[PDB]
């Protein structure tokens, strides 16, 4: 539950730049694939559990 | 206290591709 955005998945540190005024990331299918940690500002990938 | 010391005029022009902003923080 990252600042209200809820979901299930496995986190993973990514190499993406997130335009620091942004918080969430989405793919083509509008699925949340990258969420920023609101406490340490790093970007984490969202992958569905196997 | 204020006084009317500006009274600026107005005109018209063509606004090209401008005024685009980020709709969300996605
Ligand atoms: C929210 O609060 C936390 C807790 O203080 C902030 O995390 C802190 O961030 C600073 C800046 O990066 C860290 O200082 C750095 O620490 C490393 C490792 O010790 C050191 O090598 C650097 O020179 C620098 O001093 C600090 O350690 C870190 N604290 C914790 C507990 O992780 C966080 O930045 C705050 N959120 C925002 C948006 O600022």
Three-class DSSP labels, chain A: CECCECCCCEEEECCCCCCCCCCEEECCCCCEEEEECCCCCCEEEEECCC
Separation between Cα atoms, residue A16 and residue A31, nearest integer Å: 17
User: Which of chain B's residues have a Cβ under 8 Å away from the Cβ of A25?
Assistant: 26
For A38, residues 6+ apart whose C-beta sits below 8 A from its C-beta are A2, A3, A23
- A37 neighbors A26 (Cβ within 8 angstroms): no
State residue B6 phi and psi, 5-degree precision. Answer: -115, -65
Q: CA-CA distances (angstroms) from residue A35 to A40, B2, B3, B13?
A: 12, 51, 53, 42
The residues on B that touch A, with CB distances below 8 Å, are 22, 25-26
Question: Which ligand 1 atom is the nearest neighbour of the CA of A38?
Answer: 38
A20 Cβ inside 6 Å of ligand 1: no
Stated in angstroms to one decimal place, the resolution of this structure is 3.2
């Amino acid at each position: 539950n990252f600042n209200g955005l809820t979901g299930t998945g496995v986190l993973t540190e990514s190499n993406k730049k997130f335009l620091p005024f942004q918080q969430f990331g989405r793919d083509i299918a509008d699925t949340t694939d990258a969420v920023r940690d609101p406490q340490t500002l790093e970007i984490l990938d969202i992958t569905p559990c196997s | 206290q204020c006084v009317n010391l500006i009274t600026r005029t107005q005109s018209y022009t063509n606004s090209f591709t401008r005024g685009v902003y980020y709709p969300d923080k996605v």
